[PDB]
Amino acid sequence: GSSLASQGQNLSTVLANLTPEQQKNVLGERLYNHIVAINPAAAAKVTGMLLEMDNGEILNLLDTPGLLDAKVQEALEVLNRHMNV
């Protein structure tokens, strides 16, 4: 009756469950910066879109060459001329 399970600080272990949520956020912030100074007219696309079909997959390995390469090219190739998905 008045003897339920002994739970401590469940909420504390709830924040630790936000790894892919926070990471995604940081990635973008740190992303736009890599390209902002390099390819300003793409960062917005690279950061927002980032997770694209092709250029996206690679993104999994946020690198200086690949990323900055498949980011600026793809961003400049498609540009804001986006519409569908």
Side-chain angles (χ1 to χ4, degrees), residues 46-60:
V46 174
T47 315
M49 295 308 91
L50 185 58
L51 297 103
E52 334 203 11
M53 273 301 267
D54 51 300
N55 168 60
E57 303 280 273
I58 298 109
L59 88 82
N60 226 137

Side-chain angles (χ1 to χ4, degrees), residues 17-34 43 46-51 59 62:
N17 216 250
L18 300 177
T19 300
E21 189 190 82
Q22 303 290 0
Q23 179 181 294
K24 273 297 113 197
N25 277 235
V26 77
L27 297 193
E29 314 236 83
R30 316 223 159 286
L31 231 121
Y32 198 104
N33 168 110
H34 75 232
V46 174
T47 315
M49 295 308 91
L50 185 58
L51 297 103
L59 88 82
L62 291 146

Side-chain angles (χ1 to χ4, degrees), residues 32 40-46 49 74-84:
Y32 198 104
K45 264 299 136 214
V46 174
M49 295 308 91
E74 183 43 89
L76 260 180
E77 207 213 8
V78 65
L79 258 135
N80 283 36
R81 294 285 171 291
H82 230 189
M83 221 239 186
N84 233 252

